[PDB]
Amino acid sequence: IPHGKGGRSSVSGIVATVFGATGFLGRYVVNHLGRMGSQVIVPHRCEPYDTMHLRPMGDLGQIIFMDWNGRDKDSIRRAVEHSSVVINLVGREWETQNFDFEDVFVKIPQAIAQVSKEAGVEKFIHISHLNADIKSSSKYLRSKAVGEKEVRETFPEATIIKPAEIFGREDRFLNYFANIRWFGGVPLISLGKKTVKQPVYIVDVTKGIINAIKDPDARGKTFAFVGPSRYLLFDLVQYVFAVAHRIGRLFEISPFEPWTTRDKVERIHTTDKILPHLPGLEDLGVEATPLELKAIEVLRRHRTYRWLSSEIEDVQPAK
Amino acid sequence: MNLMLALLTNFTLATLLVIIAFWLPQLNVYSEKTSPYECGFDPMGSARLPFSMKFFLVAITFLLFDLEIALLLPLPWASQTANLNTMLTMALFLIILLAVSLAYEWTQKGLE
């Protein structure tokens, strides 16, 4: 039950449990739950120090930390016992040299679709992507579609979310570009055919959740997040170099956290603008943010003062 | 032929330890905030380097006292010599010729 103003130090009824919550997507969620105030039980894998910038979000006794491996059952059956909602965003990029990567999107969202489901939770939420299609792409992009399909068997009403591609503040998607101060700028693959996707702004995706977390009546009704205005061009890569003007890893360096001479060069250019009958963002209101307002901020190289911004795009066509 | 391999050892050991200390953990996998906070305690400082007169005259004055020590430099080689009344009375000239250049400027230095 709620009480008083929801500024800080209130009760607000909900008791979430947000798995992951260290990466760019999982962290920025917990910031908006350390405002309205709630028992946001965040468990973390193996990181004592790398989670320290998360503590001045929970007021005093709001958040709480636990350690958990993920494959073992009861390590994720001990935190899910006292909860109201539980959302999932676990996962990564490329296959690691210890794990198997196949069932990690199959058994592990099912390992927390175990007695977690039975114990009395509600509003269990998973994530998707706008390009995860069971047609022959990719090793990561499909086998996420296994997680769309093989985990849908349990919890027949979830509101699994299907956000668009994200541009943000500390992300990897747009930041994979303009970090290519290198012996050449090679696009994918010297072509501007299907560029670009829908770069939704990360504040909207973390505002969609917290409007769905007490919506009500949003269970089973999966959602797909609208992007900015409107499609975009290959001019994006030219626009990135327009204004730019050309955790827990190791002690010295981690010798393998690469740029992946594999599927990753084409894990983003397979676009597949999916079904526009999905409800999917504006009805999960209210949020609609462009790119050309929030583009100055995260792009940051050695000029640092002089921008003189005028670069834009028409729509582009098929708008 | 080691003079010249007496120093190219010393500089390639010098440039070795720089790139290993600097550039090798510069490729590490931390968060690495690139925000413009890297300058300390003089945040913006929206000005050009202003001229300071009392810190220009210190440059020129040294340069004109630096020349005639190289004239004064071959005094130990001017010992094992011929006619030495010339050698003594000319060696005393340059020092006084350096000394007067003090005393004229010494009546106006400024807060140096």
Ligand SMILES: NC(=O)c1ccc[n+]([C@@H]2O[C@H](COP(=O)([O-])OP(=O)(O)OC[C@H]3O[C@@H](n4cnc5c(N)ncnc54)[C@H](OP(=O)(O)O)[C@@H]3O)[C@@H](O)[C@H]2O)c1
């Ligand atoms: N919606 C989108 O547009 C989009 C884009 C890219 C990726 N994704 C996927 O959607 C989620 C977004 O995550 P993100 O953007 O914050 O990047 P992220 O680096 O994948 O962060 C997600 C967290 O999951 C952790 N993790 C990886 N393997 C794990 C395992 N076996 N067990 C427990 N934790 C594990 C990661 O490292 P730790 O174990 O150290 O915590 C990380 O902290 C991820 O699942 C991601 O693969 C979505």
